[PDB]
Structure formats: structure tokens, C-alpha cells
């Protein structure tokens, strides 16, 4: 009786939100950006090849200086690369080799990683002993760690396969805030540039916008038909793009609270692993299961170019803070650095 | 062309490369085994004989180092991390023979033995384990014999025309799992009957792994 009545009210509320979004859907982003000229053909060459991982690479993250990057592989090795020289700065042996994510702190003093061990491990890069040591092991998730991102040297946000995200106080080792509401495994998260909000994509084919300080879900974004594997904020923080197993990328708007554009092709039938934007946000770069990275026109939904330099899945990618280059990691155990030429 | 500090940084990178190569060679020699099986299937008892996320068991037997990975504690979506174990030497699957007449606790309407069949079929026919052999442990054989006298296989298998002898009942269950193998040429299934008092379970894994290693070398050379 009471349960049946309540679940009917949820359907009424869902229709109310859907009608509200349709009311403000006066135009389409495709119609708005029809007049602007296309980006043309985007040609990028492999400037660097980072060799040394002996297993599948699962994650990479640039440092804020746009020169150092950290990559994680399931050979149990965290490697920090000097991208200008291809020098290996550090090689961190992981206690658990089943790593799925890695993060570089914006200060450059810490890196984080974690996988099927349900732990986010923090590594100190600047010690008087000259070696990288574990500074914290963040326990509390009951599923695998899918993504982690530093807010500063003391705070980090993690998403897990137990359907929840958590905000951690690194010094105390406790999760100050728990973000619940996903009905599937949360696979990725992206921080807003001001680090006051973050979006997360789960296997319930939905993306939720969370307030870091308040600790509740502000908005929920649906439209995907399969699990979301990747998510990335637009450079101004007012939009984000997702990548799913349905071979599509979608651009959702925070203020319009709805999807704005879909990035899919008929030839593309494989899942998407990673998404990122160029510095101006005009380009959307996505890594795919078909061993390729497709560069999309964010405004016009046109495939601007292809990065074809890997013999297995493109598992991760990232664009430097200065926008100079893009790195692609792959299951073939190699990292490649790309940029164009005049 | 390089400065004094640049040359020293390159030398440090070379030392890191040397250490990465040594670790990879050591890892390649070890045998990786994925330990699978439903709950209350005797899988925990197997680990003790072999002596909150993933549990890794390390043991050595006849100069062979084994790394067994237990993933039963993980309750998340299997398809999001099952590809992480692509490349293991073999998969060890545990099935409790005494659970043929039992009913799944959560579902209350699904046979416990039939629950393992759909799990075995998914793993055996998984795209990530096309060329991976499977070691099948049929546990609780002593308890299975006791239940056979009271409860026949007709409850678990309505379309069973065999007798109720211990040997015939156990053999039929083994053939049921091996028939789920939709790729009988790329992979092989090794079936063993285990018990809590058995001490030859480690030897069977070693013999099965040795057979997998030999066939891997023959396939690599292109002979197969």
C-alpha cells in the first residue's frame, strides 16, 4: 500500500524532471555550431614512446607541470616518466599488482593508485631517504577501486565498484564524506577545475553530479545505453563528456541539466575506455577498444582525426595542462606522446 | 650534447630499466592460477590444502612457484575485472558434489548445482579465457556418496537414466560440466575428485599445470 504509492510518486517526479528538461531544450548544440568552420583534419605524430611496462597499462595521469606523468600497469609497477627525455624518474613496486587507477597530486609530491585490493594507496615522492614510500592506505571500500583524484595534498576522492564514491582525509586515513546513489559499479570520476564538484559515471548508465563539501548528489544525467567507463569535465567546468560501452560519447551540460551532443560513428561498435578534452575544449579525444583513439570535434561532433599507434586496447589517455601533448596508454604495455606540427 | 646532470639522470633511468627487466623475468616464471567457484563449494578447504578484495596465495611445489588468486570476496560486476586475469596459466574451478540436491539460499528456487553450471559455462566460454585450460575440482565426494543413498540424482537431473551407484552418479556430473565446454580444441578441462582428507590435490594441479606448460610451448612453436 504505502510502498506502491511511493514508487508511483517517483515515476511522477521522473516525468516532471523529463518535462522540465524538454522545456529548456529550445535548440540543439548541432544547430548552434553549424555556422562555425570545422577544425579540419587533425594530424598528430608520435613524439615519444614510453617503454618499460611489461604488462597491460590500465591508467596514466599527467602532472601539473605538463612534463612528468605517472602510469600504472598490472606488472605491479607505478612508473613516473620524464616525457621530454623519456627518462624514468621513479619505479614504484606495488604491493598489489591488480591496479586499475593512478593519480598524480597537483603539487607533485604524491601519487595514488589502487585496484581489486579495494585500497587507495598514497605514495610520497619527496622524502629525505630518496625513495618513494607508502604514506597512507585508504581502506573502506568493499569493491575494487576504479578511479581516484587528488583535490590537494590532504584530500582525495575515490570511486569504487561497491557503487559508492568517497572523499578521504589523507592525514587521518578516514573517509569524511560518502557519496551514495549509484545502483552499479562506479567506473570513473572527474573533478571540476575549482574542485568544488565532481561527476561520476557508473554501470547503471547514469552520471551523477556531486557537491564535494555538501556531500549530496545535485544532478543525475542519463541517456547512455550501457555502462559508463570514462568521464571528463569541460575546461570551463559547465559541461562534461562521458564514454560508454555502446560506442558513443555524450556531452552533458550542467546548467541545462541534459545531454547536448552524441559522438558516435557507424564503423565504431566497440566500447570506449577514456575521454579527454583539449585545452580550449574544442577537441574531444576518446580511447577505444578497437586499438584506436578518435579525435572528435566537440562542437560539431565530427571525427577530426585518429591516433593509431597501439596494437591493443587504448586503456587511458590524458592531455597536459598547457595543452601541448596527449598521452595514450594501452594494453600493449606502451605509452605514446602525441602532438601536431605546423 | 647532454649536461652533467642530464647524463646522470639517463644512467638512473638505465638502472630502473634493468630492475624492471629482472622483475619481469621472475614474474614470467611463476604460474598464475585463477581460483573460482561458488560459495560453500569447498574452495576455502582447497586453499588450506595448497598452503576485503582479492586474496593471493603463494606456494611452491617441485621447484614451481604458484600464484593463486581468489576473487570470491568481490561482489561487484565480474565483467569489469575478469579481463584482468587474461593470461593466467590455468583456472581452478571448485564444484561441490554434495550440493546437487541443495537449493540456492538467496534464490530459494534455483538448484545449487545448476548455479555452478551457469558460472562454469560463462567462465569456460568467456572470450578472455579462450585458450586457458580449466582445472575442475569436484569436492565433497565423501558427503556426496552419503546423500546419493538418501537423495538420488533425479532431483538435480530429471533427465537422468543412470543408476544410483557412487561411481555412476559422480561420472555423470563430471560429463555434464565438460559438455559445457564450447571450445574443446583450444582448451582442455582437467577434472579431479577431492575430499577434506585428500592430500593428492596439490599433485593433480602440478600434473595439470605441467601438461598446460608443455602444450603452450608446442603451440608457441607452431607445431599445433
Amino acid at each position, epitope marked *: 500500500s504505502e510502498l506502491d504509492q511511493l514508487r508511483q510518486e517517483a515515476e511522477q517526479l521522473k516525468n516532471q524532471i523529463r518535462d522540465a528538461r524538454k522545456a529548456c531544450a529550445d535548440a540543439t548544440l548541432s544547430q548552434i555550431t553549424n555556422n562555425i568552420d570545422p577544425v579540419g583534419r587533425i594530424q598528430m605524430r608520435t613524439r615519444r614512446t614510453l617503454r618499460g611496462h611489461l604488462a597491460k597499462i590500465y591508467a596514466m595521469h599527467w602532472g601539473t607541470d605538463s*612534463r*612528468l606523468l605517472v602510469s600504472a600497469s598490472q606488472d605491479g609497477k607505478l612508473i613516473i616518466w*620524464d616525457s621530454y*627525455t623519456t*627518462n624514468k*624518474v*621513479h619505479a614504484i613496486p606495488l604491493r598489489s599488482s591488480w591496479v586499475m587507477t593512478c593519480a598524480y597530486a597537483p603539487s*607533485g609530491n604524491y601519487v595514488a593508485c589502487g585496484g581489486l585490493d579495494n585500497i587507495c594507496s598514497i605514495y610520497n615522492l*619527496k622524502t*629525505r*631517504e*630518496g*625513495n618513494v614510500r607508502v604514506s597512507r592506505e585508504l581502506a573502506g571500500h568493499t569493491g575494487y577501486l576504479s578511479c581516484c583524484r587528488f583535490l590537494d595534498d590532504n584530500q582525495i576522492v575515490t570511486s569504487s565498484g561497491d557503487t559508492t564514491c568517497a572523499l578521504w582525509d589523507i592525514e587521518t586515513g578516514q573517509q569524511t564524506t560518502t557519496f551514495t546513489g549509484h545502483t552499479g559499479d562506479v567506473m570513473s570520476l572527474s573533478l571540476a577545475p575549482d574542485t568544488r564538484l565532481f561527476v561520476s559515471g557508473a554501470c547503471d548508465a547514469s552520471a551523477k553530479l556531486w557537491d564535494v563539501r555538501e556531500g549530496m548528489c545535485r544532478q543525475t544525467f542519463t541517456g547512455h545505453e550501457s555502462d559508463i567507463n570514462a568521464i571528463c569535465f569541460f575546461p570551463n567546468g559547465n559541461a562534461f563528456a562521458t564514454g560508454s560501452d555502446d560506442a558513443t560519447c555524450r556531452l552533458f551540460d550542467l546548467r541545462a541539466d541534459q545531454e547536448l551532443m552524441t559522438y558516435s560513428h557507424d564503423n565504431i561498435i566497440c566500447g570506449i575506455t577514456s575521454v579527454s578534452f583539449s585545452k580550449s575544449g574544442r577537441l574531444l579525444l576518446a580511447g577505444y577498444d578497437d586499438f584506436n583513439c578518435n579525435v572528435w570535434d566537440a562542437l560539431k561532433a565530427d571525427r577530426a582525426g585518429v591516433l593509431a599507434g597501439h596494437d591493443n586496447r587504448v586503456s587511458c589517455l590524458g592531455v597536459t595542462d598547457d595543452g601541448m601533448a596527449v598521452a595514450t596508454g594501452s594494453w600493449d604495455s606502451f605509452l605514446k606522446i602525441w602532438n601536431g606540427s605546423s | 650534447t647532454l*649536461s*652533467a*646532470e*642530464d*647524463k*646522470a*639522470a639517463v*644512467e*638512473r633511468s638505465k*638502472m630502473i630499466d634493468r630492475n624492471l627487466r629482472e622483475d619481469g623475468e621472475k614474474a614470467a616464471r611463476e604460474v598464475k592460477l585463477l581460483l573460482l567457484g561458488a560459495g560453500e563449494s569447498g574452495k576455502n578447504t582447497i586453499v588450506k590444502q595448497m598452503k576485503t578484495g582479492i586474496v593471493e596465495t603463494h606456494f611452491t611445489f617441485k621447484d614451481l612457484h604458484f600464484k593463486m588468486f581468489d576473487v570470491g570476496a568481490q561482489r561487484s560486476e565480474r565483467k569489469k575485472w575478469i579481463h584482468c586475469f587474461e593470461g593466467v596459466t590455468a583456472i581452478i574451478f571448485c564444484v561441490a558434489l554434495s550440493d546437487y540436491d541443495l537449493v540456492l539460499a538467496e534464490d530459494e528456487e534455483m538448484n545449487r548445482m545448476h548455479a555452478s553450471m551457469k558460472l562454469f559455462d560463462s567462465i569456460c566460454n568467456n572470450k578472455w579465457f579462450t585458450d586457458t585450460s580449466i582445472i575442475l575440482f569436484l569436492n565433497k565426494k565423501d558427503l556426496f556418496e552419503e546423500k546419493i543413498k538418501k537423495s538420488p540424482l533425479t532431483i538435480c537431473y530429471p533427465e537422468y537414466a543412470g543408476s544410483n551407484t557412487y561411481e555412476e552418479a559422480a561420472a555423470y556430473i563430471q560429463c555434464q560440466f565438460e559438455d559445457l565446454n564450447k571450445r574443446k580444441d583450444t582448451k582442455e578441462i582437467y577434472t579431479h575428485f577431492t575430499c577434506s582428507t585428500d592430500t593428492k590435490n596439490v599433485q593433480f594441479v602440478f600434473d595439470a599445470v605441467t601438461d598446460v606448460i608443455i602444450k603452450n610451448n608446442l603451440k608457441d612453436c607452431g607445431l599445433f
Partner: single-chain antibody
Amino acid sequence: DVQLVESGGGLVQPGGSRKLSCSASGFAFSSFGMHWVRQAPEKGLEWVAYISSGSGTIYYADTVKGRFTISRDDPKNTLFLQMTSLRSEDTAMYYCVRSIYYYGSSPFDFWGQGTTLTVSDIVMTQATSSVPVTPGESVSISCRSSKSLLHSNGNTYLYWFLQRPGQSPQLLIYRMSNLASGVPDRFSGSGSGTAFTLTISRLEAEDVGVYYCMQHLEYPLTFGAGTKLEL
């Protein structure tokens, strides 16, 4: 804590042999390259030798090449300096210096206490030998080099050290602008090409000492004469 203890120094006869040891504790010894730096009594610093991490690269100063042998024992965390045919020119305090090299590292960051031995090329110039100073006042120290220390990679391999009276040298500024760990922000290093300045805002009692500018562009590493601050 990070420690570097030297031993084996003492009075030796001319033409003799002596073995200096540097025991390291509290840090990953095998990860650091090691230098020997000596200082003649009432004189400036003089670089002696270098052995890299992993013992693959070894460099010597010309004045000691062929007579000195530098070696390390990574399992024992001990650095050695075998000296032969010792001359009166070798009478100095010999310092054990650790230095690690990767992008953004701070070489020459920690020095040992040193051991005293008594026996019976880019030019770095510090023309100002002494500078009278008062507490709370800003002081600038100048250094010059015969060659440009700015490399084509953008680094300017100039280092600043402070040797307080009775103490081992401490790193202040590495690569001409970066501030070493544990050094107050009042120290600032500024330079261009061949001319460099170390500015000390709001000088304090601890800052009193001799300041050395060292180049790390190429071997042999050379020190300036040193500028002394006195009250």
C-alpha cells in the same frame, strides 16, 4: 635521520697512503651518487671525485687523478676513498656529499661532517672576499663564471652553499633559482648567463658564514673562492 659519517683521516707522512670511509645511514644509499669534496685550511672548497649510483660512472679532479680511487659498498652503505702518494697539497678536510639525479632533484643537498687529513675548467669568481653585515639588513652576494652556465635545456647549473663556522656546508640554492628543502624563503638566487646574485633578505645571526657558488654544468666541478659574512 639522514647521516653521513667520515673516518680514516689523520696525520700521514708524505708519499704515504690513507683510506677514507664514509658510512651512510637513514637513506637509500644505493640510489645516490656520491662526491668527495675537500677544503684546505683557511681556503675554499675543492671537488675531489664522483662515483655514480650503481658505480657505472667515476670522475676525478685532475690534481688527484691517478692517485685517488673512489669506491662504494652498497650492501654496507659505505663510501671509500683510497689515496696514494699523498702530498702536502692534499692536507684538507674531506667531505662526503650525497647527490641524487633525476628531473627536479636537488643534488649536493646533504654533506657529511668531514674528516681531517694532514700531510707532513670553468672559473668561478667571487671577488668580494668579505662583506660587513648587520642583522635585519638585506645582503647581496655576487658570483661570476668564465663560461655561461645556462644549458640548452633551460637549466642554469649554479649552486649556492653556506658553511657556518664549525659546520659542514649546507645547500641553499640549486640550479641558480630553486630553494633547497629546509632553507628559509628569505634566501633567493638570481642570475643570468655568467653573472649570478644571491640575495639574503632580513639577514639573521644564523646566516653568518662563508657562501660558495659551485657550477655543475660539467666536470670537474669548481667552486668560487667564497664570500664571508661578518657582523
